[PDB]
Design a protein around this motif. Structure first.
Motif, short mmCIF file in Angstrom:
data_model
loop_
_atom_site.label_atom_id
_atom_site.label_comp_id
_atom_site.label_asym_id
_atom_site.label_seq_id
_atom_site.Cartn_x
_atom_site.Cartn_y
_atom_site.Cartn_z
N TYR A 65 0.76 -1.20 0.11
CA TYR A 65 0.10 0.03 -0.04
C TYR A 65 0.76 1.41 0.23
N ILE A 66 1.30 1.71 1.17
CA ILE A 66 2.03 2.95 1.38
C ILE A 66 3.70 2.80 1.61
N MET A 67 4.37 3.42 1.14
CA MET A 67 5.76 3.28 1.19
C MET A 67 6.23 3.99 2.45
N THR A 68 7.28 3.86 2.96
CA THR A 68 8.03 4.73 3.70
C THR A 68 9.01 5.42 3.14
N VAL A 69 9.69 6.36 3.74
CA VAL A 69 10.65 7.44 3.09
C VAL A 69 11.99 6.44 2.99
N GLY A 70 12.29 5.77 4.05
CA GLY A 70 13.54 4.93 4.08
C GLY A 70 14.79 5.76 4.01
N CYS A 71 14.93 7.04 4.36
CA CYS A 71 16.23 7.85 4.75
C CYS A 71 15.91 8.92 5.52
N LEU A 139 21.59 16.75 12.95
CA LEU A 139 20.29 16.32 13.33
C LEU A 139 20.15 14.87 14.25
N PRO A 140 19.15 14.58 14.67
CA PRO A 140 19.13 13.56 15.83
C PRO A 140 19.79 12.12 15.34
N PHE A 189 1.02 14.29 27.15
CA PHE A 189 2.28 15.11 26.98
C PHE A 189 3.57 14.36 26.79
N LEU A 190 3.42 12.90 27.26
CA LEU A 190 4.99 12.11 27.50
C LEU A 190 5.27 11.65 25.99
N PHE A 191 6.49 11.28 25.87
CA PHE A 191 7.17 10.79 24.79
C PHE A 191 8.00 9.83 25.33
N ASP A 192 8.25 8.53 24.98
CA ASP A 192 9.02 7.53 25.39
C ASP A 192 10.26 7.33 24.29
N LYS A 193 11.10 6.43 24.75
CA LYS A 193 11.99 5.78 23.62
C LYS A 193 11.39 5.38 22.45
N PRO A 194 11.43 5.63 21.21
CA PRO A 194 11.02 5.14 20.03
C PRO A 194 11.26 3.55 19.96
N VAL A 195 10.03 3.03 19.46
CA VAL A 195 10.02 1.57 19.40
C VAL A 195 10.10 1.11 18.01
N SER A 196 9.62 2.46 16.99
CA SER A 196 9.45 2.17 15.50
C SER A 196 11.12 1.68 14.94
N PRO A 197 11.08 0.63 14.37
CA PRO A 197 12.29 0.11 13.80
C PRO A 197 12.91 1.06 12.75
N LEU A 198 11.91 1.93 12.30
CA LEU A 198 12.17 3.20 11.24
C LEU A 198 13.20 4.08 12.10
N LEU A 199 12.75 4.46 13.22
CA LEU A 199 13.16 5.57 13.93
C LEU A 199 14.67 4.90 14.46
N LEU A 200 14.43 3.66 14.97
CA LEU A 200 15.62 2.98 15.51
C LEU A 200 16.94 2.88 14.63
N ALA A 201 16.57 2.23 13.67
CA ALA A 201 17.82 1.99 12.83
C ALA A 201 18.35 3.19 12.18
#
Lengths: 378, 368
Positions: A65-71, A139-140, A189-201
């Protein structure tokens, strides 16, 4: 300089070329064997390379369906040095936005028409969110612990100088008590450590939670996240349908923060072509998401619902609270565009689109078809 | 979990349940020593052994038909408490060993025939299964928030479905009078469980919150949200085209999974147990392919019971029976539907033979 990239250059480009055969993201769509051989030797002043830029896309094949940016960009220069990779991705992701196009920023709430009275009988809450990068820092995905800490210091100092309606308080994740994180969780209002492999990678989650924190004013109508996905994530919100008020607070808050940064000879990353610079290409231009939690039990189940949103250049997300448990259909509706439209224009489309959604809802409430209310694609 | 801490202050024998006069798989496996070894454990969500066997303690069951007598509270239940589930699974699923491996196969292309079972005998056919979303507790243990979150995911995913599919969601709670009526007319409305087996496991909590039913305009593909499992997918159709019913079953199902994954979500599953579901009896494929056929002659034959067991089928109004595959684990979805197509052909053949007043003994199937 880049001993590692130097070692890789000793291998033929095709030996280092990623296997994207089973991938489906924008990066894999644009990264030809030719493009890889052309840019793999390049490096940004901070040492960020093409391999760094695309790693997440290699690790995460994306989906159907939908693609991710990948970069991702590791610094402001990444977009220039690797423009041959980013440009087609950007053109594709933002509906044909060309390398030669210009992005216009408009943060003057006065240019917005109406929007101060979205029917409170339907609009439960309104919110406007964006992201910002501070020029001169990586950047992060790439920022060092030192840079990250410097950014937090700058952000906290500026935020602490806000007063009146914006008087607030900073909450560092490192020192957060169970009690304050529970309150922040309850207020969303809270954010935790990302669990998305997209962000983690991408490397953005390093040293968690060092230098990460949450700030919000006393009235809980303005919230700022520091060093999560981007240097800053600024959110304005409140109950009701007064989008104008939310947007005004949004603009005035961002303006005061920038002035404070200016006082210290610091400024947001921005240019006429890409607008505000952020880690992910999908968030360029305005990086703005203006939305409402709106009760639409009738329209929400209607077959043309998705179609109506697409035509209004809007997008929906379902909710999982008691609100929708009762109404049986509360939705989070926001603008789909980010680049090529000004902030005023994006917010205006939410305002305009929302009014039509409500008219269609009331039409359905009276058991009548909404056929003659169906709009033309915008 | 501190309630379990208190319980651990009593010796195991004082907490060990009285299972005399209980006829369920759990009761036939749980020993005082197995209880003493597992009663202090808990899955990350906090589900305990006591929570697993509660429904088996509360429901003695029936002297004839045997029940499983236990449920999984989350995905890790089948691991943390495998010493209890494994024996039960081997017992419930024809010897399926802990060493065995399940093989899933949802390719309707592997289904040989079944495109048209004699319409004169088969009134209708249908295939159904269950699915669990990884990351959330199962119905016996899921919190109101988890359930609502699960419902959010399912609805948007089902919203994206389209084609001969594409349908409307119907939340039980906010369901309108006309809607409830319309659904009953389509025979799709389901309500709060009356079954003491489900009630005892804590599955009906907060009813009807976060529960709903989604079906297609065509009324051939149906999905129940948060009932006995996160999702219950059903494919149905009048007639005997079990092949077409299974094809639509597989596709609609592949798409749902498709949409779920496109948001970093996936069905609970592993090489050994196939798809993870609340009740152990539904593991592997958790699939039931059935047909309504008229087998009056057979219906009153003294080999009808043996014939079904031979074909690995099950029965549940002139000779109108509800026949389906009996297996769930250790057999692919394609294999289960194939056995129903093969056996049905053989059932109709025997039915006709009986009508002609002939033997049929030579048609007695070899125990598949």
């Amino acid at each position: 300089s880049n001993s590692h990239n130097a070692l890789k250059l000793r291998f033929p480009a095709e030996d280092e070329f990623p296997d994207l055969s089973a991938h489906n993201n924008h990066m894999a769509k644009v990264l030809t064997p030719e493009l890889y051989a052309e840019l793999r030797a390049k490096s940004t002043p901070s040492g960020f390379t093409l391999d760094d830029v695309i790693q997440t896309g290699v690790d995460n094949p994306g989906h159907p369906y939908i693609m991710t940016v990948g970069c991702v960009a590791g610094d402001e220069e990444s977009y220039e040095v690797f423009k041959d990779l980013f440009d087609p991705i950007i053109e594709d992701r933002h509906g044909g936005y060309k390398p030669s196009d210009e992005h216009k920023t408009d943060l003057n709430p006065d240019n917005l028409q109406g929007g101060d009275d979205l029917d409170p009988n339907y609009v439960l809450s309104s919110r406007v969110r964006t992201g910002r990068s501070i020029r001169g820092f990586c950047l992060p995905p790439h920022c060092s612990r030192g840079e990250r800490r410097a950014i937090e210091k700058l952000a906290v100092e500026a935020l602490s100088s806000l007063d009146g309606d914006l008087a607030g308080r900073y909450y560092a994740l490192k020192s957060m008590t169970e009690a304050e994180q529970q309150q922040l969780i309850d207020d969303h209002f809270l954010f935790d450590k990302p669990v998305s492999p997209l962000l983690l990678a991408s490397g953005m989650a390093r040293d968690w939670p060092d230098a990460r924190g949450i700030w919000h004013n006393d009235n809980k109508t303005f919230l700022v996240w520091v060093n999560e996905e981007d240097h800053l994530r600024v959110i304005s919100m409140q109950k009701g349908g007064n989008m104008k008020e939310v947007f005004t607070r949004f603009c005035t808050g961002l303006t005061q923060i920038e002035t404070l940064f200016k006082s210290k000879d610091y400024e947001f990353m921005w240019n006429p072509h890409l607008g505000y610079i952020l880690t992910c290409p999908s968030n360029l231009g305005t990086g703005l998401r203006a939305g409402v939690h709106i009760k639409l039990p009738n329209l929400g189940k209607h077959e043309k619902f998705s179609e109506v949103l697409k035509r209004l250049r809007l997008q929906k997300r379902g909710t999982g609270g008691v609100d929708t448990a009762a109404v049986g259909g509360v939705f989070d509706v926001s603008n789909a565009d980010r680049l090529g439209f000004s902030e005023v224009e994006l917010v205006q489309m939410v305002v305009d689109g929302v009014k039509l959604l409500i008219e269609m809802e009331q039409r359905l409430e009276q058991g009548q078809a909404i056929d003659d209310l169906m709009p033309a694609q915008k």
